Amino acid sequence: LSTQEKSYLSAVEKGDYASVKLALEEAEIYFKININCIDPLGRTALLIAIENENLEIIELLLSFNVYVGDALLHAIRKEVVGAVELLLNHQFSDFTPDITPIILAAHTNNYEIIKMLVQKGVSVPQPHEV
């Protein structure tokens, strides 16, 4: 949680573009900061970007190969649509280890997201009957 990381997280949250771009540029050359830092509330850059729905920021982050984790599930849970399209074509969990993307999508009615997942091809287990 160095001051450069705090400044960079604030830049991502507010929505400044040039600042985050040059920060990702100058981060690699020196290794003085980490792009995968964690907020005191457990919110890396990708999570907050997804929450605010900044598609350009999201793509920029993706291009520089940031760790994904349950970002797909986080985007599904918050009904963001285009982010799902971006996130498909590419150990403190939050959801129980028994949730697959189609299941969590079905939990929250969303015709678009469900129709997008189904075409890729998934299946849901049929539990044993008693």
Binding site: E13, K14, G15, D16, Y17, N52, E53, N54
Partner: peptide, 22 residues
């Protein structure tokens, strides 16, 4: 969850315009 997005969009627009004019 709606107010936050609506505010940050304005903020980002402001940054873009201000930075692009200098």
């Amino acid at each position: 969850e709606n107010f936050k997005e609506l505010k940050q969009d304005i903020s980002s627009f402001r940054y873009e315009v201000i930075g692009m004019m200098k």
